[PDB]
RNA sequence: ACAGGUGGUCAGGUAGAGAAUACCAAGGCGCUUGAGAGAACUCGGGUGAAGGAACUAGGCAAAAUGGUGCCGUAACUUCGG
RNA sequence: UCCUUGUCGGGUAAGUUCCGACCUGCACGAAUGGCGUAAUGAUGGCCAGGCUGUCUCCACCCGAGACUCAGUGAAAUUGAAC
RNA sequence: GGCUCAUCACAUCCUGGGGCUGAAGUAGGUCCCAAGGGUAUGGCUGUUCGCCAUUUAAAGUGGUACGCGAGCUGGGUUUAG
RNA sequence: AGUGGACGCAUCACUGGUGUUCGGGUUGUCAUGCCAAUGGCACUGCCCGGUAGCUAAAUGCGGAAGAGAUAAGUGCUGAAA
């Protein structure tokens, strides 16, 4: 089921200009997350729209997101689908954090 | 509806396939034979008197012995009545089992909780335990003030202070029902119920929604 | 004020007095500071004064507070004036008006 | 709060209690007659009866452990030699309570705790 | 009577026996969303509390220089397999003294049997 | 169980090392902060080259508690040393980039997915 | 027949520097009300999950260190500390 | 030192306490001695590390009372009391 | 004065129901009814009060001879130095 | 519809605390003739644990949802007029 939702999320984000897409596999390294997908956001408005987009297709796909974090700050925001977790980040803000070290 | 009569036996937790622990209370409620049926015309209220268990014939008081003889049932440890609720009617000598509680799924259990003897104020009403140091003399856990100055001059009855707690009727409401067994004479209810191991208690359907 | 654009709240209520600092009480009880009343103003309101008709600051962003009239100074009780030169502290020091 | 608790302390500390029954167990075995107040005799069954059933079998280690109690070679020699075979066919209840009124000192409940036969 | 019979019907009969101080590998189930994985857990048991179906044991491991203590219930479906790697050699039922001493100076030898 | 007037450890690369919790949050007469909560702290010790300057007051999140958490199957996760991860004042976003040490799984329901994404151990 | 005060003479063994301390030798005693109940509460203590002075006027009380051998030991200073 | 919680800085999140600086000395002042002083103090105040039931917050346990029984058996006070 | 224990009144801090509103919605302002419940922790001084930090929806105001020392402490008041 | 803060009831089954009537480690000493093995004293001699019971920080629940008459208020019919 993980691969199906992985394809379902990677296509939708790319439909609204989602650049720098890298699919990670943390199976074995960590026991919390199954798949890791990373995304880039230029600034605050559209990355919130991406978070708004993914959360509302999830409600239309049956799977209910079990937690979000981004509030009154668009430097980071997460939308969760269980096995697959999406990290949409600001390009300037990402460089402070790690890229492909998780 | 009516309830049932059981008694605490022990505490255990039941395991679900999802990996959730539900601590249940083991209650043994056997066939509660009805000893008397009360009607509005003869008694002013509709209720049935029920008993359970067996009592040694030597200790069965003779006036009590005739009471069970009229009902056609053998001796019991007590004679509690559970009120009726406008539409279910029973007969004298009828036996009711655990299967009645197969759909209630929420019960309130009441009984005589453990007696604490002459417990203190702190153990009874959870007072604030005046400081035990900084010069305090001969008063570390005493109630302290109990009233006002020369104004009225009495302590209002109902004051919370030292006395006897426990060994009194107490009810815990809306206890989740986990499993009911009629063949093995078992009643598993989520949570804890008053009383000690072997103390008699009565279980009724929850009055709350 | 970003979540409004109305200005009638200035004609409906034109005169307001900040509460006078309560006088000192016995038992050496000081007077509580008068609660600071916050006047919400819509963005883009330049303020002028009778006298120095220069703006203290233009309102551009949302979520900042600007002081337009500082409060006075509390008075001094006779307890603070305890001494042996007078040997009888009874003089009173009133507070400076805002 | 003494709920489901067993064993008294008789307004006496632990050091006294162990020594108290140390003499009590030895005296009962040595003489097979006692005039003590009921709470002593009632609580006396805690010690002596486990000692007698400790003598059901004879062993070097068993006697050493039995020697840790009664603090006496003479008392333990009396066990494993006559108390054993006499009580071999009896499973428990080696002592009997026989209340005997009140003493003249402070009117305490007087009682007898005794062996079944005492072979006397 | 009725309590003991209720205890035994829910009992797990495939739990291996380990000593108080052995190195034990335990796999614990996780309930997350709809799919479940197995979590392998390293550590050494420091305490054993065998009490009916509610028997429990405490295991300790060191991660990133910080000690974490984990407890389990022997007869619960959350745990899947409890395997012993090396058998310890200690005469204390409760290994509560491991907290004070540092890890590198508190290695436990093998039982040799 | 962590209440006011206590010093804790730091589980991120923000710069602080010894922090002292400033006030428990959650409601009136809140005696104890759990493991998933918003606990605000103050700095008692930090590296001078770090992002945070010693003595500042700012929010944090507790990650490790000596008592531990309560699993739904009667299990606890005991630790060795209380730890916290810093937060911004107005926003509940932690400032650190790395998280050191394991983290309990109960924080998933707590809605603090910063720590869950980081901290590869558990 | 009082938990008080009262000067000198003799000073065993063990470990200990010791007339401190713990046990013991000869010797002298169990202190002239006890037997029970194991409540609040009062007094003297033991221990304690997490916190570590957040209580209080005040670290009050408690709690804590405590010996031996080696290394090492700051400002100041009258050169001794 | 009335204006003294004088004004500023340090210490703490917050310091009418404490330390440093500024002199506007009501009422400092040189044997009814002034200025510094190592050491010393069951001397006053403040701060720090450890420590802990002081406290959050109380629970259990051990002994002496308190309670029952038996013997001996007190005192302040008291106009009269249903 | 602090600790402990509280009681009552409403001139209501929140929660509850409405009028007006200069009530677009949210967030509010005033007034009416309503006492059922709840109605902070700390640093500073003995301080009640109060300055500040920080929470909650709230840290309400009063009476009770400004409650409560045959309940506790004596930090201010304190005869004798 | 859930999850929390404060309060109340139950609870030992889970997490623990106590658990001087349980076991074990160990110091000094005395004693049981001696080796070995045990007992007393030194706060339970100092400690490590831990049965039951009690207990909270541990887990289950409770405040209701409703009904009748109502305050402020909103109304219908509706004359006095």
């Amino acid at each position: 089921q993980g691969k199906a939702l992985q394809d379902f999320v990677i296509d939708k984000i790319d439909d609204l200009k989602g650049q720098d897409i890298i699919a990670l596999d943390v199976q074995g390294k960590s026991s919390i997350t199954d798949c890791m997908i990373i995304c880039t956001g230029t600034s605050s408005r559209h990355v919130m729209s991406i978070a708004d987009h993914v959360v509302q297709e999830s409600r239309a796909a049956g799977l209910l997101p079990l937690g979000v974090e981004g509030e009154n700050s668009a430097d980071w925001i997460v939308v969760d689908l269980g096995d697959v977790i999406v990290h949409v980040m600001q390009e300037e803000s990402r460089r402070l954090y790690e890229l492909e070290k998780l | 509806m009516i309830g049932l009569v059981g008694k605490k036996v022990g505490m255990t937790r039941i395991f679900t396939e999802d990996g959730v622990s539900i601590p249940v209370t083991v209650i043994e409620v056997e066939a509660n034979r009805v000893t008397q049926v009360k009607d509005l015309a003869n008694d002013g209220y509709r209720a049935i008197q029920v008993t359970t268990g067996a009592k040694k014939a030597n200790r069965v008081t003779k006036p009590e012995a005739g009471h069970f003889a009229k009902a056609g049932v053998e001796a019991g440890r007590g004679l509690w009545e559970f009120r009726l609720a406008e539409g279910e009617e029973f007969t004298v000598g009828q036996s009711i089992s655990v299967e009645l509680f197969a759909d209630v799924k929420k019960v309130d259990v009441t009984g005589t909780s453990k007696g604490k003897g002459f417990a203190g104020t702190v153990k009874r009403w959870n007072f604030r335990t005046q400081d035990a140091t900084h010069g305090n003399s001969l008063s570390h856990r005493v109630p302290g003030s109990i009233g006002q100055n020369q104004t009225p001059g009495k302590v209002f009855k109902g004051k919370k202070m030292a006395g006897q707690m426990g060994n009194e009727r107490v009810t815990v409401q809306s206890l989740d029902v986990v499993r009911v067994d009629a063949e093995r004479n078992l009643l598993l209810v989520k949570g804890a119920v008053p009383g000690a191991t072997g103390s008699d208690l009565i279980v009724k359907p929850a009055v709350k929604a | 004020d970003e979540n409004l654009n109305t200005l009638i709240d200035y004609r409906f209520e034109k005169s307001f007095r900040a509460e006078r600092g309560q006088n000192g009480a016995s038992r050496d009880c000081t007077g509580k500071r008068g609660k600071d009343v916050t006047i919400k103003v819509p963005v883009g309101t330049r303020v002028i004064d009778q006298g120095t008709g220069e703006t203290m600051g233009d309102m551009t962003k949302h979520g900042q507070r600007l002081l337009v009239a500082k409060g006075g100074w509390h008075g001094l009780g006779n307890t603070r004036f305890k001494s042996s030169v007078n040997r009888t502290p009874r003089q009173k020091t009133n507070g400076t008006p805002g | 709060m003494r709920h489901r608790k067993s064993g008294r302390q008789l307004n006496r500390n632990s050091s006294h209690r162990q020594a108290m029954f140390r003499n009590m167990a030895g005296s009962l075995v040595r003489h097979e007659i006692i005039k003590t107040t009921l709470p002593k005799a009632k609580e006396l069954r805690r010690v002596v009866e486990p000692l007698i059933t400790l003598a059901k079998t004879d062993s070097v280690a068993n006697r050493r452990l039995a020697f840790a109690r009664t603090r006496d070679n003479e008392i333990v020699a009396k066990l494993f030699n006559e108390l054993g075979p006499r009580f071999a066919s009896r499973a428990g209840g080696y002592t009997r309570i026989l209340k005997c009124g009140f003493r003249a000192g402070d009117n305490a409940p007087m009682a007898y705790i005794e062996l079944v036969d005492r072979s006397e | 009577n009725i309590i003991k019979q209720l205890e035994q019907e829910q009992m797990k009969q495939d739990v291996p026996s380990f000593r108080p101080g052995d190195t034990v590998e335990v796999k614990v189930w996780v309930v997350e969303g709809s799919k479940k994985r197995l979590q392998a857990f390293e550590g050494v048991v420091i305490a054993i509390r065998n009490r009916g179906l509610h028997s429990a044991f405490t295991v300790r491991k060191i991660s990133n220089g910080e000690g974490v203590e984990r407890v389990f219930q022997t007869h619960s479906p959350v745990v899947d397999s409890i395997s012993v790697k090396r058998r310890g050699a200690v005469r204390k039922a409760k290994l509560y003294y491991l907290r004070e001493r540092t890890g590198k100076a508190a290695r436990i030898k093998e039982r040799l049997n | 169980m962590i209440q006011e007037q206590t010093m804790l450890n730091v589980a991120d690369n923000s710069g602080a090392r010894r922090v002292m919790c400033i006030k428990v949050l959650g409601g009136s007469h809140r005696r104890y902060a759990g493991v998933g909560d918003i606990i605000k702290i103050t700095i008692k010790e930090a590296i001078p080259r770090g992002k945070v300057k010693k003595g500042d007051v700012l929010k944090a999140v507790v990650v490790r508690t000596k008592k531990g958490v309560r699993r739904p199957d009667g299990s606890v996760i005991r630790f060795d040393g209380n730890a916290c991860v810093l937060l911004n004042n107005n926003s509940e976003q932690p400032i650190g980039t790395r998280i050191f040490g394991p983290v309990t799984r109960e924080l998933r329901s707590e809605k603090f997915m910063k720590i869950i994404s980081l901290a590869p151990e558990v």
Side-chain angles (χ1 to χ4, degrees):
Chain A
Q1 192 66 255
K3 199 263 185 182
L5 281 293
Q6 184 178 2
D7 292 334
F8 179 73
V9 65
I10 189 65
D11 287 33
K12 289 189 326 288
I13 62 170
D14 293 334
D15 274 19
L16 282 72
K17 305 303 151 283
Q19 54 273 50
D20 215 357
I21 58 171
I22 295 93
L24 283 72
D25 48 298
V26 65
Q27 302 204 329
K29 271 79 70 176
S30 179
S31 178
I32 183 68
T33 62
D34 195 3
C35 295
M36 201 36 48
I37 192 66
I38 186 68
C39 289
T40 304
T42 299
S43 67
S44 296
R45 282 210 31 187
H46 80 282
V47 65
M48 281 213 77
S49 310
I50 301 299
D52 184 49
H53 187 193
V54 298
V55 75
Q56 69 182 358
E57 318 314 300
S58 174
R59 299 292 179 90
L63 283 72
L64 297 176
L66 61 83
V68 286
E69 187 67 27
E71 187 173 1
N72 67 50
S73 182
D75 284 331
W76 195 61
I77 190 167
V78 65
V79 164
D80 62 358
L81 302 181
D83 48 353
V84 293
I85 312 299
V86 65
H87 292 351
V88 289
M89 282 165 168
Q90 283 215 9
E91 181 36 70
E92 188 68 29
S93 295
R94 184 191 300 191
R95 311 315 307 142
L96 281 291
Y97 298 98
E98 96 275 22
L99 180 64
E100 301 174 355
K101 291 89 168 195
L102 186 61
Chain B
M1 313 176 248
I2 62 170
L4 294 175
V5 181
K7 64 90 176 179
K8 185 183 286 185
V9 185
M11 301 285 278
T12 303
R13 34 191 174 71
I14 301 299
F15 286 5
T16 62
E17 211 196 0
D18 294 331
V20 176
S21 187
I22 297 89
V24 301
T25 303
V26 176
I27 298 284
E28 181 275 300
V29 55
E30 61 86 20
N32 290 318
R33 301 141 289 114
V34 175
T35 63
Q36 188 176 0
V37 175
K38 273 153 201 294
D39 186 74
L40 295 163
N42 204 6
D43 298 301
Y45 68 98
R46 210 205 311 171
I48 61 164
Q49 184 164 231
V50 74
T51 198
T52 178
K55 181 196 206 193
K56 255 153 58 184
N58 182 356
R59 293 263 161 200
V60 176
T61 300
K62 201 185 157 266
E64 268 188 340
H67 182 74
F68 300 96
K70 182 183 181 179
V73 304
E74 61 86 20
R77 314 182 329 249
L79 294 174
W80 321 287
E81 66 182 2
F82 293 170
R83 293 181 110 92
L84 277 296
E86 187 49 46
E88 68 275 16
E89 293 82 3
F90 288 146
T91 61
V92 177
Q94 182 177 0
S95 298
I96 53 174
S97 68
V98 180
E99 291 266 280
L100 185 62
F101 282 163
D103 63 298
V104 296
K105 69 95 175 179
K106 285 180 70 66
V107 292
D108 49 348
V109 187
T110 187
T112 61
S113 68
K114 302 180 185 137
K116 306 322 210 323
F118 191 83
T121 63
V122 169
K123 199 168 185 45
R124 197 175 177 190
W125 318 96
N126 195 358
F127 290 167
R128 265 282 308 157
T129 62
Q130 303 168 0
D131 289 330
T133 45
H134 292 283
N136 203 358
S137 295
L138 304 176
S139 296
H140 294 350
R141 218 189 300 278
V142 299
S145 292
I146 62 170
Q148 284 52 51
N149 65 345
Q150 178 185 358
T151 190
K154 64 198 180 199
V155 286
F156 323 105
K157 64 183 181 293
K159 191 40 157 40
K160 319 154 90 156
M161 89 180 171
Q164 195 277 357
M165 65 179 288
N167 201 359
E168 266 191 342
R169 204 170 206 288
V170 66
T171 308
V172 181
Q173 294 82 17
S174 82
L175 281 293
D176 178 321
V177 176
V178 182
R179 180 216 302 284
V180 287
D181 291 332
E183 61 275 60
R184 273 193 326 247
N185 220 312
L186 274 156
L187 183 63
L188 299 181
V189 62
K190 188 171 153 270
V193 302
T197 296
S199 58
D200 48 353
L201 60 84
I202 62 170
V203 57
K204 317 199 245 194
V207 74
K208 265 80 175 180
Chain C
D1 291 331
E2 189 170 0
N3 195 0
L4 61 83
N5 193 0
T6 73
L7 280 78
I8 299 169
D9 290 340
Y10 303 110
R11 296 179 77 224
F12 166 73
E13 193 172 1
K14 293 182 185 294
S15 303
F16 187 78
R17 296 179 182 177
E19 57 263 27
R20 180 255 306 278
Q22 283 104 20
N23 290 318
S26 295
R27 284 200 220 291
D28 205 82
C29 295
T30 56
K32 180 67 174 66
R33 202 171 179 296
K35 286 206 172 255
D36 294 342
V37 57
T38 59
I39 301 299
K40 310 169 311 193
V41 65
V43 71
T45 299
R46 184 174 294 118
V47 298
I48 313 175
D49 291 334
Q50 318 197 320
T52 180
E54 197 267 335
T55 179
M56 292 135 269
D58 283 331
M59 272 315 268
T60 68
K61 274 293 151 273
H62 186 228
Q64 74 280 59
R65 294 179 66 188
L66 189 152
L67 197 51
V68 304
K70 297 176 286 294
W73 268 99
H74 68 94
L76 276 298
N78 69 330
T79 300
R80 200 71 79 73
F81 294 165
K82 54 179 306 162
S83 57
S84 56
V85 285
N86 284 313
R87 263 279 304 274
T88 304
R90 204 141 191 161
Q91 65 274 16
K92 179 186 185 143
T93 300
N94 281 355
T96 61
Chain D
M1 202 146 67
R2 214 211 73 69
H3 274 197
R4 305 299 287 167
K5 264 152 161 203
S6 84
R8 294 191 210 71
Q9 63 84 30
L10 283 72
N11 300 295
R12 310 207 278 232
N13 44 287
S14 177
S15 296
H16 202 89
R17 264 172 282 151
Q18 296 294 321
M20 187 66 204
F21 292 169
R22 178 49 45 64
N23 264 287
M24 211 55 38
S27 184
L28 191 84
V29 170
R30 184 201 310 310
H31 292 171
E32 304 155 302
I33 184 168
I34 183 62
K35 186 180 289 293
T36 185
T37 189
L38 181 83
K40 311 289 163 82
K42 184 178 184 293
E43 185 67 25
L44 186 151
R45 288 173 278 109
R46 295 276 108 186
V47 184
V48 65
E49 274 163 335
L51 287 160
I52 310 156
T53 189
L54 183 63
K56 298 294 288 185
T57 187
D58 207 24
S59 296
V60 176
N62 196 328
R63 193 164 310 211
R64 281 186 182 176
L65 183 63
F67 175 64
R69 273 149 273 208
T70 69
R71 202 49 191 165
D72 199 322
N73 63 7
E74 281 326 289
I75 296 304
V76 65
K78 191 175 202 43
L79 281 76
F80 297 95
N81 287 318
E82 55 258 51
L83 277 296
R86 282 173 54 197
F87 284 150
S89 66
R90 176 166 284 143
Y94 318 109
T95 58
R96 63 176 62 192
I97 299 291
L98 294 174
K99 304 128 193 171
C100 52
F102 296 110
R103 76 165 73 241
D106 56 359
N107 316 121
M110 295 298 102
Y112 278 14
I113 190 167
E114 295 294 329
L115 302 189
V116 178
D117 62 329
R118 305 161 57 254
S119 187
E120 196 77 27
Chain E
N1 290 318
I2 188 54
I3 281 298
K4 189 187 234 173
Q5 185 211 49
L6 180 54
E7 295 279 321
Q8 283 303 30
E9 62 92 20
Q10 205 174 183
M11 201 46 98
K12 186 172 301 154
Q13 73 304 330
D14 292 330
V15 291
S17 295
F18 45 74
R19 298 289 300 273
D22 291 331
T23 304
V24 298
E25 207 59 24
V26 59
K27 305 142 181 303
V28 56
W29 286 92
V30 56
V31 287
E32 182 38 31
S34 180
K35 64 90 176 179
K36 314 212 291 193
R37 317 167 313 263
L38 276 297
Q39 193 144 350
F41 195 79
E42 293 286 331
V44 64
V45 63
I46 62 170
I48 278 169
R49 176 201 213 272
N50 63 6
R51 217 65 55 90
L53 71 83
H54 64 279
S55 299
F57 63 95
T58 76
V59 67
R60 270 194 48 173
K61 64 168 263 161
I62 301 299
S63 176
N64 199 0
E66 181 156 20
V68 63
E69 181 192 270
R70 189 88 190 270
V71 301
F72 295 102
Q73 265 71 24
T74 62
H75 307 288
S76 297
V78 289
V79 297
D80 189 358
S81 175
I82 321 183
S83 298
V84 176
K85 300 289 94 175
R86 57 181 291 274
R87 224 80 61 82
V90 68
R91 52 191 329 172
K92 263 282 182 73
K94 302 290 96 175
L95 283 72
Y96 286 112
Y97 61 93
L98 264 291
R99 325 193 174 288
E100 292 158 340
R101 304 185 308 170
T102 190
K104 72 182 180 71
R107 297 284 74 78
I108 318 164
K109 66 191 172 322
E110 204 265 327
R111 186 179 295 276
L112 276 73
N113 62 345
Chain F
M1 293 177 70
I2 288 159
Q3 63 264 20
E4 61 86 20
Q5 187 65 41
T6 191
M7 72 291 291
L8 307 94
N9 289 51
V10 176
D12 63 358
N13 50 359
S14 58
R17 283 321 311 182
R18 181 53 53 151
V19 298
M20 202 285 278
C21 82
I22 193 66
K23 180 66 69 177
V24 64
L25 183 63
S28 178
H29 272 147
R30 181 42 164 281
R31 286 155 296 268
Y32 322 105
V35 183
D37 271 319
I38 306 99
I39 190 167
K40 184 172 74 176
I41 62 170
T42 189
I43 317 304
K44 284 292 151 283
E45 183 178 1
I47 294 91
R49 295 293 181 93
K51 332 192 171 193
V52 182
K53 175 292 181 183
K54 164 282 181 193
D56 291 331
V57 62
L58 73 165
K59 311 261 193 84
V61 65
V62 56
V63 292
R64 273 83 71 92
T65 300
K66 193 147 290 292
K67 182 174 72 68
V69 299
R70 169 64 73 188
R71 276 293 174 77
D73 63 358
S75 297
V76 298
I77 324 297
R78 264 161 280 191
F79 296 108
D80 291 331
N82 299 307
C84 282
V85 177
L86 303 200
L87 295 175
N88 282 6
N89 224 317
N90 314 77
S91 66
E92 301 315 349
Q93 297 299 107
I95 190 74
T97 66
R98 302 281 83 79
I99 301 298
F100 298 156
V103 182
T104 61
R105 214 91 81 81
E106 51 76 20
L107 188 153
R108 211 83 173 281
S109 179
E110 294 294 327
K111 210 92 159 183
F112 293 63
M113 292 276 248
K114 314 292 281 312
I115 301 299
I116 303 159
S117 66
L118 294 174
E121 289 291 329
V122 176

